[PDB]
Design an enzyme around this catalytic site. Structure first.
Site: not given
Lengths: 152, 152, 152, 152, 152, 152
Positions: F19, F23, F45-48, F65, F71
């Site tokens: 989250h 990060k 996941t997307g951003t990570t 994301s 998730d």
């Protein structure tokens, strides 16, 4: 939030907790690792703790049963830096009345950054890890500064 | 479930907790009833606690901040019979991070049958009740009997 | 935010609600306080209500059963200033399907600042409180100001 | 459980509810179907209802705002068979305080088996359905047999 | 938030899911609508899917049982745009272990704006709707732009 | 129920999720162990995912994301036996909209008995564990038998 460090001692203070459908599972795990666990300090919720001391003869500091407050007792010990490892086998297939307590306990274990296992595979990985039997430093939130900024 | 009794002492052990958007509301309630509250023993979560002792001069046994473990510390105290009255002003119009801790705290207070107030009206009624300053018994679950059933 | 005031009438409109495992507790409590509850107006969810009326002979305005919408009906009445006191014995040791309805009802009771009891000790204190049979002003949010600030 | 039948009127009682970040969505949707909606009876939560009436001149029976008890007022109307359709664009991406009220509302709409839309796509399929303007029989729980069973 | 559009093909990919107490209902609903359902592509959770094919002879792509991951598999498919319609009859009167999964799946169906039915009444309105067999455009969140912002 | 076994390959399929508030903590952990992680297969996941690859130049199979379905994509792969380890640094001090998604993922990771780390200390213990680079057998639910009983 600013962080500081805390040392997890060689002799770990381990909290053992399991929901009813996971009890026999936790018991099996505890029995096949007894020689090792006998070297640390054990804590447990009411039912779990008594079952373990009964089955293994090991010395366990039993708190209140979970539904009756045991979960929060362990949570408080964790926030006080009294617990170093948490083994919590919660039932992922049957809703329990103390669900908020369960989530609350895991939340705190996350916050205080201590090793946590919610299943056997994670438990085995943890107890086989080198620092399980040695002292090691972890990063924890600096509560003193956290609180001070709250009062400004 | 078999029940037994516990006696709430004349000088009640009162826990005071409030979410941020409710702190001013709690502060004011405490100041208005200070003459009465000074006669009892006060406990509170980290922030709430310090804000009170500072603004009133009263002695408050401050635990850790709610998010950092304070709520569970209070829950543990309640389950151990060390807290007799719970005043908890949680925010009903703003989700919070320690929501599970909140629900778990209220659940335990319900379980152990202690006077609990989650708003000003209830708090006023409780504090104005005749036996607030008296020793009075309350029915509590019979843990021992409860545990035995479990180990059977 | 923006607060105003409401006057709870001397003859209180009391809502009585209990989860199955707590119905006996509620029932006993009602029987022991029938003389006083005899006065005041009583409301209740489906099952709870009929049982009370059937064992005490008192007049009770019964809504739908909790799971069928009774909790929300009581909730609505509270927000409309039709309920002055809420006696809600929810089961803290068992999960229920209408859990959100339960939490929602307690949220509204908190928001509208009315006396709420979730265990026997709290109920005893509220009913024994001096101003229980008197008209008492409570601080409530000013909805008009709140709504005006929404359609700005 | 026992199930009986209910007839949804040709002229439906529609409940319109939207969370803040979904309001513009609901507004547009309403504007695009205004001619058709004007043929039915409209209900809404405080904020939503006023915004719609102010922009379309439509006659909307506005309840209290959601956070203040409007959701439960709608839930109750549904359980009482006074609401035939529910258009509730809740926010699946933001916090929202009245979360339990949201879940409780959707729970009842499911229980009482009435057309429910939580997004535009579903809202469109429902309003464009051929029997949207006709009387339609739906199966609903038979409360009488339900309560009778709960008793005796 | 930036929005774009997607076209639901004339031949829809329907996901069928039902909790145990609601399986019989879904079964009957499927049989009464078998003619139309045959012209589409069906998906379902492990148990639900097998019962359906083993009773209707229709071809059903069965995922894993819901409690074992089925709900999340369906969830993933939706976000990937491989599911166009979701018929999910969840039990509104019984607590289930995969409660979070249920809520997470409903959340996603709302986010991706696809037709969703949680009861028979809604299921009937959706399936009879004119564009159930036509290609329809729906507004969906523009993920490309949403991601790009996150990585600014 | 009936349990069978599965063998995690020596070369693990690792899922990395964090989250926003965690990060930076995950990035730091990743770079600190890049040499080892380089020998395994990474998912996220997307951003990570994008943040990681775009910083270490390591190959990362990025999903959507979290709020948009990522998730559940991860949860689906875990249930399918495609993910062997899960590192999920979720924010314990800030509530997220996709909370149900978060809990559901953790629930599945528990059911399928894979190593799970929710904080740095747990992640370090697991990655520093000897068998992290070996083929290791874990006990998992016998899905075949499970489903068999369901259709008995």
């Amino acid at each position: 939030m600013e962080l500081t460090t805390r040392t997890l001692p060689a002799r770990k203070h381990i909290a053992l907790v399991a929901h009813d459908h996971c009890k026999q599972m936790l018991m099996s795990w505890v029995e096949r690792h007894q020689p090792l666990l006998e070297q640390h300090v054990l804590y447990a919720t009411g039912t779990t703790g008594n079952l373990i001391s009964r089955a293994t003869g090991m010395n366990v500091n039993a708190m209140l049963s979970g539904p009756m407050g045991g979960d929060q007792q362990v949570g408080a010990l964790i926030s006080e830096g009294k617990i170093d490892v948490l083994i919590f086998f919660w039932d992922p297939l049957n809703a329990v009345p103390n669900d908020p307590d369960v989530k609350a306990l895991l939340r705190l274990a996350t916050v205080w950054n201590i090793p946590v296992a919610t299943n056997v595979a994670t438990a085995d990985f943890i107890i086989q890890s080198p620092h399980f039997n040695d002292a090691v430093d972890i990063l924890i939130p600096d509560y003193q500064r956290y609180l001070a900024d709250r009062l400004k």
